[PDB]
Amino acid sequence: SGAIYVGNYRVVNRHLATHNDWANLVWEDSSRDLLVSSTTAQGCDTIARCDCQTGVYYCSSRRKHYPVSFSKPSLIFVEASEYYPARYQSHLMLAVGHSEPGDCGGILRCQHGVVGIVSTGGNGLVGFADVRDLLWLDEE
Ligand SMILES: Cn1cc2c(CC(=O)N3CC[C@H](C(N)=O)C3)cccc2n1
Ligand SMILES: [Zn+2]
């Protein structure tokens, strides 16, 4: 579990979004596994605006923050799960690291701020949904 709180926005994995999130929906994309909902309170996270390929992510299944190298956002084949059939997920970045389904929502960050959240994994590889292209998160 986990979310990014930037301004009056809440960014979560689409497959973990709540009823309040769907009721207060701003934008969602099934192919990115992302959902953004509105909030009444202001958040304190900063979204990175960069091309960094190194950062640190939180892994709740180990209670640890791991430094990683990750690939640039791309269209990747993702195996079926209880949340989606087998499909291609867009804007996804991979790293060599540990992850379990419950780790989704863990933040990946670089020196410029939040890069994305854990979204896929298995076989010693962890995938993160990129948020750095969503410029509107910094305004209105
Ligand atoms: C973070 N992580 C996801 C894992 C999965 C796959 C899985 O449960 N999901 C849920 C939806 C997500 C998606 N975006 O398609 C994939 C299997 C094994 C280890 C995993 N570590
Ligand atoms: Zn950066």
Q: What's the CA dihedral at 7, 69, 67, 83 to 10 degrees?
A: 60
Structure-determination approach:
X-ray
Question: How many angstroms does the Cα of residue 134 sit away from the middle of ligand 2?
Answer: 14
Q: Which residues, including other chains, have CB under 8 Å from residue 42's CB and lie 6 or more apart? A: 7, 8
Q: Are 32 and 41 in contact (CB under 8 A)?
A: no
Q: How many CA atoms lie within 13 A of 72 on its CB side?
A: 4
Task: Say how far apart CA 98 and CA 85 lie, in whole Å.
Answer: 23
In this structure, the residue with its CA closest to atom 13 of ligand 1 is 120
Based on the residue annotation, tell me whether 33 is a catalytic residue of this protein.
Answer: yes
Q: Are 137 and 11 in contact (CB under 8 A)?
A: yes
Looking at residue 88, its amino acid is Y
Ligand 1 proximity of 16 Cβ (cutoff 6 Å): no
Sorted by where each begins, the domain ranges of the chain are 3-44, 45-140
Question: How many angstroms does the Cα of residue 86 sit away from the middle of ligand 2?
Answer: 31
Reduced 3-state DSSP string for the chain: CCCEEEEEEEEEEHHHCCHHHHHCEEEEEHHHCEEEEEEEEEEECCECCCCCCEEEEEECCCCEEEEEECCCCEEEEECCCCCCCCEEEEEEEEEECCCCHHHCCCEEEECCEEEEEEEEEECCEEEEEECCCCHHHHCC
Based on the residue annotation, tell me whether 15 is a catalytic residue of this protein.
Answer: yes
Ligand 1 proximity of 15 Cβ (cutoff 6 Å): yes
Q: Are 26 and 38 in contact (CB under 8 A)?
A: yes
Q: Is the dihedral of CA 128, 133, 139, 140 positive or negative?
A: negative
Based on the residue annotation, tell me whether 91 is a catalytic residue of this protein.
Answer: no
